[PDB]
Amino acid sequence: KVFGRCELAAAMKRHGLDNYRGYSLGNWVCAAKFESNFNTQATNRNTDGSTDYGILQINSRWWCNDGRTPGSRNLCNIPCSALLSSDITASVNCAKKIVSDGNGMNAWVAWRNRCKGTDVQAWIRGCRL
Numbered sequence: 001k002v003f004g005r006c007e008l009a010a011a012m013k014r015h016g017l018d019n020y021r022g023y024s025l026g027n028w029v030c031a032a033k034f035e036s037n038f039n040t041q042a043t044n045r046n047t048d049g050s051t052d053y054g055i056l057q058i059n060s061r062w063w064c065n066d067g068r069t070p071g072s073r074n075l076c077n078i079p080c081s082a083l084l085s086s087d088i089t090a091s092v093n094c095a096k097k098i099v100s101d102g103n104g105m106n107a108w109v110a111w112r113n114r115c116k117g118t119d120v121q122a123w124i125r126g127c128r129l
Contacts, residue, residue, distance in 0.1 A: 001086045003038040003055070005029065006127035008088075013129055016093040021099045025129075026120030027111065028095075032056060033123065034110035039083055040091075054083035056091050056108070063094055 003011070008028045008030050012018070018025040035057040036042040050061035050069045060069040064080035076094035083091050098107045105111045 001040050003032075003040065003088075005033070005038070005123065006129075008032060008055075009124045009127050010129060011088055012092065015089065017092060017095075020096060023099070023105055024120065026123040027105060027115060028118045028119055029123040030118070031105060031108045031111035033113045039048035040086055040088065043084070051080065053080045054085075054089060054091050056083075056095050057110075058083050058091065058094055058098070063098065065093065078096055 009025060012028050013025055017028045032038055032055050040055045040057065042054065042057065044057065046052065048061060048070075050059050051066060053061050053064065053066075058064055058076070058080070060066045060080050061071060061075040062073050064078050064083055065072055065074040066080040076097050078090055078094060083094065085086045099105055101107065105116070
């Protein structure tokens with residue numbers, strides 16, 4: 001399924017992402033916009049054999065296990081298939097572990113390239129939160 005901007009903002013707030021590790025809600029919505037364009041089903045294959053899964057494009061080399069990725073660490077201890085759900089719970093739970101890894105939201109290149117330093121609050125204006 002494809003989330004609407006405001007619909008996702010509400011779900012992420014519900015799951016405690018607003019100000020999680022110091023990042024306001026807008027940051028998370030902005031990251032989802034440029035990582036997957038709010039698409040919970042998106043996947044992308046990489047040159048290293050890994051695959052990025054879901055709305056937050058979580059990588060199979062370090063975070064989830066898809067069983068076909070060389071050097072997998074599965075630091076979120078979850079199958080990657082769980083990240084392709086309409087329910088964003090698994091993705092948010094893993095994202096919380098990723099951002100606590102010392103790199104902050106830099107773990108998401110799209111956020112780094114298009115959200116960081118911008119008016120991320122724009123992503124939640126107009127929303128009923």
